[PDB]
Amino acid sequence: GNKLFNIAQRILDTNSVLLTERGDHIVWINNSWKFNSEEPLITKLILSIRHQLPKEYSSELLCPRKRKTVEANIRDMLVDSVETDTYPDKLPFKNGVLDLVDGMFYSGDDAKKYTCTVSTGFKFDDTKFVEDSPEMEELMNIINDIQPLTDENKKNRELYEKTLSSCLCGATKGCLTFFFGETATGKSTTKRLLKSAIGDLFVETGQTILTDVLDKGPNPFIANMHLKRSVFCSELPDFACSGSKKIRSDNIKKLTEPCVIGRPCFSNKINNRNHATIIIDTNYKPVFDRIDNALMRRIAVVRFRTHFSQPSGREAAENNDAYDKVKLLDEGLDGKIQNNRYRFAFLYLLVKWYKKYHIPIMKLYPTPEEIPDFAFYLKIGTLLVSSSVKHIPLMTDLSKKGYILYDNVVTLPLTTFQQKISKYFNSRLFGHDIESFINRHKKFANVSDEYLQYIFIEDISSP
Amino acid sequence: GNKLFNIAQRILDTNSVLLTERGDHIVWINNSWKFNSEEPLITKLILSIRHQLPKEYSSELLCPRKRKTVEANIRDMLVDSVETDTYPDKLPFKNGVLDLVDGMFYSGDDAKKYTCTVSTGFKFDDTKFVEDSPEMEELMNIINDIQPLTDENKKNRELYEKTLSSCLCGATKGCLTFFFGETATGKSTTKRLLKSAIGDLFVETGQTILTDVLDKGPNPFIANMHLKRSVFCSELPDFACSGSKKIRSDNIKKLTEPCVIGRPCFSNKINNRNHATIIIDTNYKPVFDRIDNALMRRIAVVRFRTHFSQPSGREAAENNDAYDKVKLLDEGLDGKIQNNRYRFAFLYLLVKWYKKYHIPIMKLYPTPEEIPDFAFYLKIGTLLVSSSVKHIPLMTDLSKKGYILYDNVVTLPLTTFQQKISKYFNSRLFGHDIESFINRHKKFANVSDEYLQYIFIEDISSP
DNA sequence: TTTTTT
Numbered sequence A, B: 001g002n003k004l005f006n007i008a009q010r011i012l013d014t015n016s017v018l019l020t021e022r023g024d025h026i027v028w029i030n031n032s033w034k035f036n037s038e039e040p041l042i043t044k045l046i047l048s049i050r051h052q053l054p055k056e057y058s059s060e061l062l063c064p065r066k067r068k069t070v071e072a073n074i075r076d077m078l079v080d081s082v083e084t085d086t087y088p089d090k091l092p093f094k095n096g097v098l099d100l101v102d103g104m105f106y107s108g109d110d111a112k113k114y115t116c117t118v119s120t121g122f123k124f125d126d127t128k129f130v131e132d133s134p135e136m137e138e139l140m141n142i143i144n145d146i147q148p149l150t151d152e153n154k155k156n157r158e159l160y161e162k163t164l165s166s167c168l169c170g171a172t173k174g175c176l177t178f179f180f181g182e183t184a185t186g187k188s189t190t191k192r193l194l195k196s197a198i199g200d201l202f203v204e205t206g207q208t209i210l211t212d213v214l215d216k217g218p219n220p221f222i223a224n225m226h227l228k229r230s231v232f233c234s235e236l237p238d239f240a241c242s243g244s245k246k247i248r249s250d251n252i253k254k255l256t257e258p259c260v261i262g263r264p265c266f267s268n269k270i271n272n273r274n275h276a277t278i279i280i281d282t283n284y285k286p287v288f289d290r291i292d293n294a295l296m297r298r299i300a301v302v303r304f305r306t307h308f309s310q311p312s313g314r315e316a317a318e319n320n321d322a323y324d325k326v327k328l329l330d331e332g333l334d335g336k337i338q339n340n341r342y343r344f345a346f347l348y349l350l351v352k353w354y355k356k357y358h359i360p361i362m363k364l365y366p367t368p369e370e371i372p373d374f375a376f377y378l379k380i381g382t383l384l385v386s387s388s389v390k391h392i393p394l395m396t397d398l399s400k401k402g403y404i405l406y407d408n409v410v411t412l413p414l415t416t417f418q419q420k421i422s423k424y425f426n427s428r429l430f431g432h433d434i435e436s437f438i439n440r441h442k443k444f445a446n447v448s449d450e451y452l453q454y455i456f457i458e459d460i461s462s463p
Numbered sequence C: 001t002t003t004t005t006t
């Protein structure tokens, strides 16, 4: 047969070009998988791999028309599709893949077996990926300044390290984290360090993903989150001001699912794979429209309690309760960070933290006791018990306290209930929470019959 | 005699390429029908079929331009169109078609007679399609944990295993299903299991198809469900909060018809075939704009009452009325599900359930008792009976009860209606319903004359 | 208004 078909067959035999389910062709060039929806990178591969072919086939690949013919043959012979990005414990670079389990770096065919379509965007360097380096001690000093290693801050520092370490994993995560602190506290420095550590796997979007409907019309903000591993949203408005849009809880529930529904402009694709940890940098406590048990299990908070002040205003910052330590700031730090001085030391520290927590299994846990707005419900869980058959026999005491056995179940009137809950809740500050909770569980037998099926745990105890 | 014309004729004589009603070209490659509007599948078929042609014809198909010429001839010889997807009880795979009546698996020409344009996307394997296997024993434990085999849960469990097995049929279903339950009850685990079981026949869309207008401009969220067999909408918000939009009562009526009007981007096709079971998983019960009899015959509800909790929060879970049992959570189940460990066992269980409920005939029925919003409309039909001619002779007794004859019809004026209706419904909870009802059925004989055409059943029985 | 469409 003709030599062009033989060249196409030999190229296909190396498995350097593949077709995905989304309809795009990926090519293995320069030790990386690359694709482009508007430029057919196939011809680049044809020109690049001309050296591996024998001598009599190299000369005919210098003409663009024969390259077009070979690309047409390859497109004809390529029929079926394959799946991509199935290994959550591999970190891809521009010249290889790093294994997070043991720490070796793989290049060439060894890295080809893990079909990763995303990368940091820069080459990995072994010389700078060391522990004993002049930059490392300085980075450790900076980090110990931001998060001191004290017995009081141990628990917060653990969440800090775990949340930062989770950015290397390519799996769905069921919790999003808030970075809370005052001004000049080090939150943006941490953001820029993470950006300079992970490169193109990092992205930041607007706040419209938390207050607006996601699936109405085109929405590039949701679409750009596909296959990313870290998403930052920062500088939320103060909700105390009038006209502020409160955070939608259903958006929070949707953002923790493995697939997110959204559509970019001029597109028909509506599914996006969610691999990104979500970090919200803020200065004020969040406010939600509706609070329920489903929302409280997807929220975590990390505190920042160190101030970096000019010498002129130091004496003022020492009189504030929002700070636990005041230190002079360095003016040249931001320029050093912008030049990627601490890229590989921070990456090495992130991998070292990855071994500590996520090797058995990757999991994030909520911290519902850090939000004041969640206080009302939490202690409600420790004060009331739903009515049951076991409470019927002891009615002798409950009728003494004012309970009524109505339809063979122990019951308490709303009017009888409200003062009883008023003795343990400050009616002035929790005025709205009490009327909120009473109305979603009222039970009315008749126009004049009112009752609620709950029993206090203190009354159930034997006196 | 043109050689390429002869090749085109021999290719066409094998019935390997067909033209559909929508203007698409379907090609039989690798024991499956495939079609795509952007890729040249005809050239792929021409290249693939060259081994069946005699040796003096095979060498001519190695040149792409000759393949384009044969493609042009084939396009010229296709003048008549055919119907597709007419067998509802056949499950298509990537390498064959499975019969749901007897259980046989067909491949090759035997499967070609069923013109199926969709597939699960993965190959069938009879080795793992067995009943005795460790994965089946594991899977039955999860299934029993989510839906216990107890007497109180029997009817709900049967409905649960009917709705899931309904997803293997390619017909139109006349009801919508709501998966209602509190958080951490396994609602999403069954969704993941069904996705892994059915592959490409599964689709998840947004909430706009229940709230917005489906026929204004392009709408991929409604046009991506053509010929699908399972559609999921997830996490609708709570409607108690201000600003939340309610569910269009007329939208769910269009989702039941065999044809749905919708348009993709850059497309003129406006007709979509309805073959999908529509499931919405929820944490709050839905609220509709308008309630009528046509609405109440299209809604079904399945309950989830088992809670999976960490050991820290077990004590609270036992004190919640929304749960019936609490079991320890498994942290490694999601990774196993994502790895398609329980794919073929769940497929076998779905087929076994399908043989139990749908072999005679396939139909779904509503459960209007579950929704509390309907409780008023359901009750009125049992308390009021429409006036009839046969009630005229009995009005001698009805005179003492306050009934008045108007236009030779038994009538009851508005003023005496309210205290009669107050003997069953409380004013506070049902005020908006009876106000709307009275305004929508009030009739006036004059400026000061009022009457209603209903009589109470309790009033035709002598007290 | 703007994606839509050209």
Ligand SMILES: Nc1ncnc2c1ncn2[C@@H]1O[C@H](COP(=O)(O)OP(=O)(O)OP(=O)(O)O)[C@@H](O)[C@H]1O
Residues within 6 Å of the ligand: A141, A142, A143, A145, A146, A181, A182, A183, A184, A185, A186, A187, A188, A189, A190, A308, A328, A329, A330, A331, A333, A334
């Ligand atoms: N370890 C450190 N030693 C000295 N200066 C530091 C150190 N870490 C950060 N700084 C400096 O302190 C300042 C803190 O600014 P930064 O943007 O990080 O704070 P922030 O709390 O995130 O601010 P904002 O929320 O108002 O944007 C910067 O000038 C930064 O360069």
Ligand SMILES: Nc1ncnc2c1ncn2[C@@H]1O[C@H](COP(=O)(O)OP(=O)(O)OP(=O)(O)O)[C@@H](O)[C@H]1O
Residues within 6 Å of the ligand: A294, B141, B142, B143, B145, B146, B181, B182, B183, B184, B185, B186, B187, B188, B189, B190, B308, B328, B329, B330, B331, B332, B333, B334
């Ligand atoms: N049979 C089981 N045994 C142990 N753990 C289980 C079992 N079934 C499910 N789980 C676990 O329960 C956890 C919570 O379940 P799941 O997320 O499906 O609940 P849900 O009610 O659908 O939640 P939501 O609607 O809030 O997303 C999961 O991590 C899952 O692994």
Ligand SMILES: [Mg+2]
Residues within 6 Å of the ligand: A184, A186, A187, A188, A189
């Ligand atoms: Mg900052």
Ligand SMILES: [Mg+2]
Residues within 6 Å of the ligand: B184, B186, B187, B188, B189
């Ligand atoms: Mg769920």
